[PDB]
Motif scaffolding. Structure first.
Motif, mmCIF file in Angstrom:
data_model
loop_
_atom_site.group_PDB
_atom_site.id
_atom_site.type_symbol
_atom_site.label_atom_id
_atom_site.label_comp_id
_atom_site.label_asym_id
_atom_site.label_seq_id
_atom_site.Cartn_x
_atom_site.Cartn_y
_atom_site.Cartn_z
ATOM 1 N N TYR A 1 0.862 -1.172 0.000
ATOM 2 C CA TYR A 1 0.000 0.000 0.000
ATOM 3 C C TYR A 1 0.904 1.229 0.000
ATOM 4 O O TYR A 1 2.097 1.111 -0.304
ATOM 5 N N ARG A 2 0.330 2.400 0.304
ATOM 6 C CA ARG A 2 0.910 3.736 0.066
ATOM 7 C C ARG A 2 2.254 3.865 0.789
ATOM 8 O O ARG A 2 3.233 4.291 0.165
ATOM 9 N N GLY A 3 2.356 3.509 2.064
ATOM 10 C CA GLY A 3 3.607 3.621 2.775
ATOM 11 C C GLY A 3 3.998 2.415 3.588
ATOM 12 O O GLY A 3 5.140 2.339 4.051
ATOM 13 N N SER A 4 3.091 1.466 3.779
ATOM 14 C CA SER A 4 3.371 0.257 4.532
ATOM 15 C C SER A 4 3.032 -0.944 3.666
ATOM 16 O O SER A 4 2.246 -0.829 2.723
ATOM 17 N N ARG B 1 8.690 7.889 10.807
ATOM 18 C CA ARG B 1 8.459 6.732 9.948
ATOM 19 C C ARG B 1 9.623 6.497 8.993
ATOM 20 O O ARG B 1 10.201 5.406 8.963
ATOM 21 N N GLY C 1 9.267 2.158 0.077
ATOM 22 C CA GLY C 1 7.867 2.152 0.430
ATOM 23 C C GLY C 1 7.237 3.481 0.782
ATOM 24 O O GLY C 1 6.062 3.689 0.463
ATOM 25 N N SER C 2 7.971 4.396 1.409
ATOM 26 C CA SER C 2 7.389 5.605 1.978
ATOM 27 C C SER C 2 7.907 6.830 1.242
ATOM 28 O O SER C 2 8.888 6.744 0.495
#
Lengths: 50, 279, 49, 91, 311
Positions: free
Chosen positions: D67-70, E118, E290-291
């Motif tokens: 998904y978007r960040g995880s 994060r 990912g982020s």
């Protein structure tokens, strides 16, 4: 020179300058020889430097 | 640009003078061309009393210069500009390591006149170079010679309150980045010490005048021993006290700004030099 | 297979020979001096292969 | 709270109910210990159903779901044949 | 050689103009060349932009670089180029390793013990080794001497990769640019939640440039890092940040003990460098695998790091 009840496993790292032999087979890598381009280092009063 | 400044030596230099000028070739020194007032040697002469504050004001007024080459009649040296950099070295006999410190301070040498000098017998001048040292060492030696001057003049007046070995145990050594140095503690440094003394004496009435200028908020933070002074003092005496105290405060603040503060980038301990620009 | 160690004073989890040369306890040491025992006592060097 | 665990097994349904009772035998003791079945409807401990058959040699290759960040890890059953069945209770 | 001669001959300083005052006919053709040089170095043509590349060696200055020898586990390969790095002062005299910190690995030195967090713990998952790099964080922040043991060394311009004992090169002073002569601009990357614009909190004269200040500050929970962008001077931004640090003067009041000198200092401000004010900082987004965190992009940086001055 009387024993202290304790022995000593002494270790030591000792260097050796060996003369090696490199065997690389034919057509192993592929060089890609780019073209040299020049720049400008600190161009002082007595000399210009590239 | 063309920055090679030469100075006019009257007499030719002999062999030991050549060796002693070669020994400290990498260091910087001020400038006034005359070889008479070539550096700080006219404040450190035997002509004047070695007063710290006039030496500092002369060191912050006039320009600096790092010398490149020495000869039997010439002294090749480039003066300092705010634009570009010069490679300088640490060639001072009180040796302080410039390991990774981004700032260098230029102060008069408080470790003795003989420690950072060259005495020219043949010429008319005896030159001195100022101390180029990292700034925590600079403020630490300012603390440990200022408080030692105070705690020494106190036991010269009254030795019943303090102890000389008690102040010489701590106030004679600086410890910056693991290096432990010793201070040559022997006159000098008395006017700066008495300036600081006058400042901290008149600062109670100064703080009282300032908090009365504009209430119990700023009057709670003094303690009870730090609060009580009686409200009876003449107008001219109070005004002259405040003016002289604020004058000494401004001079003392610009003096504890350690002068021309040099900055370094790449200290190479194999060759003992660092790329140095003016800041 | 007939013994567990030839010396129990260095080949244990925390022992005399281990606290002298493991890099988990050598934190107040000078990190420049070469240690020949680091290749046999430091756990990450003994484990990264 | 209730749970949804997905089981991959090569054996039949008559084997999956027995091995599911064997797998969940501590949880029956836990559910009998932490609460008491004072009613008669609390006796059932879950129910399972077959979701379909896939090949046993190349199944359940692990992948990720980004998904978007995880990203949680996901398992990816390839060549699936969906054939759902009614729920078989585990007790 | 022909390629090398054709490359050197174009990259050459033009010769200085001579006026032979002695001879007669040489003076006329030399001032003829003088006016033919001005008239093609001033007018709107391609000749006046051809003249700007010769550089005639005051205006351009090749900067200084800092060759730093770091550990690979204390750094990350996946970071952007223009990260302002912060060297830590080492107690041992002969050390050989200069422990630097990117703002994210220094943010995990902030938070581990108590968006940005994060991507920080995504880039530097294990913080025990980075807490083992610094010999003392909690005591050094307890006596509040952490600001002088941390020195900034300017933004990273070249990171040559190595699996063990990495080596980085930062511009410590001068115009921030890359090292490889295939030329590119090193855009300074600053994470946005640490970046605040001072006109935004201020809520009239146009300067020449708008500087960037880092301010290590000692919040009561732990240290905090904030990058301040100011068009004003250093001794002016000391007063402006004195206005900005409003509850700190209330906390230093409400810790009423004056002999405990720890809460009488509240951080320090160091000037990092000078970027232009007519072209403001650009916002951008920096992505990992990912982020993605929003990152301030700053171009045309001239790095000149100043001392930490006490608020």
């Amino acid at each position: 020179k009387i024993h202290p009840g304790v022995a000593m496993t002494v270790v030591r790292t000792d260097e050796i300058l060996s003369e090696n032999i490199l065997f690389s087979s034919r057509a192993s890598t592929s060089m890609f020889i780019g073209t040299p381009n020049v720049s400008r280092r600190e161009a002082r009063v007595d000399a210009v430097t590239f | 640009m063309d920055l090679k400044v030469v100075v006019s030596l009257s007499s030719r230099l002999y062999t030991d003078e050549i060796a002693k000028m070669q020994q400290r070739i990498g260091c910087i020194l001020p400038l006034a061309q005359n070889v008479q007032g070539l550096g700080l040697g006219q404040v450190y002469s035997l002509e004047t009393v070695p007063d710290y504050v006039s030496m500092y004001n002369y060191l912050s007024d006039c320009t600096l210069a790092v010398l490149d080459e020495v000869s039997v009649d010439s002294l090749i040296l480039t003066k300092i500009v705010p634009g570009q950099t010069y490679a300088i070295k640490n060639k001072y006999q009180p040796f302080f390591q410039w390991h990774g410190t981004g700032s260098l301070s230029v102060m008069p040498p408080v470790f003795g006149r003989e420690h950072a000098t060259v005495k020219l017998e043949s010429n008319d001048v005896d030159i001195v170079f100022p101390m180029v040292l990292p700034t925590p060492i600079a403020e630490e030696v300012l603390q440990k010679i200022l408080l030692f001057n105070v705690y020494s003049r106190v036991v010269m007046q009254a030795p019943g309150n303090a102890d000389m070995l008690d102040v010489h145990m701590h106030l004679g050594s600086v410890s910056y980045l693991g290096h432990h140095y010793e201070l040559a503690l022997p006159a000098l440094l008395d006017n700066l010490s008495l300036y600081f003394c006058i400042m901290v004496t008149l600062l109670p009435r100064a703080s009282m005048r300032l908090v009365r200028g504009l209430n119990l908020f700023q009057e709670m933070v003094p303690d009870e021993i730090a609060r009580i002074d009686l409200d009876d003092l003449s107008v001219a005496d109070d005004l002259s006290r405040m003016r002289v105290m604020m004058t000494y405060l401004q001079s003392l603040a610009s003096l504890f700004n350690l002068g021309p503060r040099l900055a370094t980038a790449a200290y190479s301990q194999e060759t003992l030099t660092a790329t140095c620009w003016l800041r | 297979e007939y013994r567990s160690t030839v010396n129990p004073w260095a080949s244990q989890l925390g022992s005399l020979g281990d606290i002298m040369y493991n890099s988990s306890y050598r934190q107040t040491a000078v990190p420049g001096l070469y240690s020949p025992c680091r290749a046999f006592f430091n756990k990450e060097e003994l484990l990264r292969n | 709270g209730p749970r949804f665990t997905f089981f991959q097994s090569s054996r039949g349904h008559c084997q999956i109910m027995n091995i599911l009772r064997i797998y969940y035998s501590p949880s029956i003791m836990h559910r009998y210990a932490v609460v008491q079945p004072l009613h008669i409807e609390e006796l059932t401990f879950g129910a399972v159903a077959c979701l379909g058959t896939f090949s046993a040699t190349d199944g359940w290759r692990r992948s990720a779901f980004n998904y978007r960040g995880s990203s949680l890890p996901v398992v990816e059953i390839d060549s699936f044949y969906s054939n759902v069945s009614d729920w078989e209770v585990i007790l | 050689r022909r390629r090398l001669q054709r490359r050197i001959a174009g990259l050459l300083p033009p010769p200085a103009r001579r006026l032979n005052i002695s001879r007669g006919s040489e003076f006329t053709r030399d001032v003829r060349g003088l006016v033919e040089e001005h008239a093609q170095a001033s007018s709107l043509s391609a000749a006046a932009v051809w003249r700007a590349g010769l550089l005639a060696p005051s205006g351009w200055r090749p900067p200084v670089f800092g060759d730093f020898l770091i550990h690979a586990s204390s750094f990350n390969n996946a970071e952007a180029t223009g990260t302002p790095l912060f060297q830590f002062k080492q107690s041992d005299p002969f050390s050989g390793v200069d422990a630097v910190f990117t703002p994210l690995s220094l943010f995990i030195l902030m938070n581990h013990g108590r968006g940005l967090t994060r991507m920080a713990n995504l880039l530097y998952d294990s913080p025990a080794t980075l807490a083992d790099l610094v010999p003392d964080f909690g005591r050094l922040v307890a006596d509040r001497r952490f600001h002088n043991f941390i020195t900034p060394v300017g933004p990273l311009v070249e990171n040559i990769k190595s699996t063990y004992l990495n080596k980085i090169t930062t511009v410590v002073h001068g115009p921030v640019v890359s090292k490889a002569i295939p030329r590119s601009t090193v855009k300074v990357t600053v994470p946005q939640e640490a970046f605040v614009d001072l006109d935004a909190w201020l809520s009239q004269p146009c300067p020449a440039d708008a500087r960037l200040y880092v301010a290590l500050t000692y919040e009561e929970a732990g240290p905090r890092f904030t990058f301040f962008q100011s068009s004003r001077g250093h001794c002016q931004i000391m007063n402006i940040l004195r206005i900005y640090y409003s509850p700190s003067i209330m906390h230093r009041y409400a810790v009423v003990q004056p002999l405990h000198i720890e809460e009488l200092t509240f951080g320090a401000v160091a000037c990092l460098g000078t970027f232009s004010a007519t072209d403001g900082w650009r916002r951008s987004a920096f992505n990992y695998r990912g982020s993605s965190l929003p990152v301030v992009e700053i171009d045309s940086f001239y790095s000149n790091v100043s001392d930490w001055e006490v608020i």
